[PDB]
Amino acid sequence: SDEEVLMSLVIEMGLDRIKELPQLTSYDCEVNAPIQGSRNLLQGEELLRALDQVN
Amino acid sequence: GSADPEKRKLIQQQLVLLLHAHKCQRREQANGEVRQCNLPHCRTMKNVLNHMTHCQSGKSCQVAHCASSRQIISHWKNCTRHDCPVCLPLKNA
Ligand SMILES: [Zn+2]
Ligand SMILES: [Zn+2]
Ligand SMILES: [Zn+2]
């Protein structure tokens, strides 16, 4: 995911426009964004390494 | 539970913002302790990312966007769904 792609998604999704950012709930996230059952809710600095184009 | 299409849109938007902020912050950590990006909520999600690295409250955590961000990130890492209504924009684009 090029930062070029991420900037394009940010602008296509409206995130460059001033907004209220809703505080989603862990529940609404566990429902609409389920972990495998891996049950591996990343913590520590590994949680940042994930974001380095992980598949 | 039951999937709401609107929540899935707020979720993918928070994911794009988390991914931007990380890359933004990586581009900062090499270029000095900058913190110059003025994208809406970018500073916010950078501070969220640094919170949850050293955070240990886990699900008990009420700091805005920590619990949710940690769940969304963990999903995106392992999401191998072809069809995923959250990730499909990012994975494929
Ligand atoms: Zn930024
Ligand atoms: Zn926390
Ligand atoms: Zn997904």
Numbering used by the authors:
A (entry chain B): 4 to 58
B (entry chain A): 328 to 420
Which sentences did the original study use to describe this structure?
The hypoxic response is mediated by transcriptional activation of genes that facilitate either short term (e.g. increased vascular permeability, glucose transport) or long term adaptive mechanisms (such as angiogenesis);5–7 these processes are largely mediated by the transcription factor Hypoxia Inducible factor (HIF) 1.5–7 HIF-1 is responsible for the activation of over 100 genes that play essential roles in the hypoxic response and thus plays a role in tumour growth and survival, making it a potential target for anticancer drug discovery. The CH1 domain (which differs by only a few amino acids between p300 and CREB33,34) interacts with the carboxy terminal transactivation domain (C-TAD) of HIF-1α. Of particular interest, CITED2, is a negative feedback regulator that reduces HIF-1 transcriptional activity by competing for p300/CBP. The CH1 domain of p300/CBP forms a rigid globular structure consisting of four α-helices (referred to here as α1–4), stabilised and constrained by three Zn atoms.
We hypothesized that it would be possible to enhance the affinity of HIF-1α for p300 by hybridising key regions of both CITED2 and HIF-1α (see later). A hybrid sequence (CITIF) was designed containing an N-terminal fragment of CITED2 (224–243) and a C-terminal fragment of HIF-1α (792–826) fragment. Expressed and chemically synthesized peptides were tested with both giving a KD slightly lower than the HIF-1α sequences and comparable to the CITED2 sequences. A fluorescence anisotropy competition assay established that this hybrid sequence competes with HIF-1α for binding to p300, supporting the hypothesis that CITIF reproduces key binding features of both HIF-1α and CITED2 (ESI†). The CITIF sequence exhibited p300 binding enthalpies and entropies intermediate between those observed for HIF-1α and CITED2. We obtained co-crystals of p300 in complex with CITIF and solved the structure at 2 Å resolution (ESI†). Overall, the high B-factors and the poor electron density especially for the loop regions point to the dynamic nature of the complex, which is compensated by the tightly packed crystal lattice with an unusually low solvent content (25.7%) resulting in high resolution. The structure shows that residues corresponding to CITED2 and HIF-1α bind simultaneously, occupying their native binding sites and reproducing most of the native contacts with the protein (ESI†), in line with the thermodynamic signature we observed for CITIF binding. Binding of CITED2 to p300 however is characterized by small favourable enthalpy and entropy changes, yet (in our hands) its affinity for p300 is slightly higher than that of HIF-1α and therefore may also augment the allosteric changes that accompany ternary complex formation between HIF-1α, CITED2 and p300 en route to unidirectional displacement of HIF-1α by CITED2.
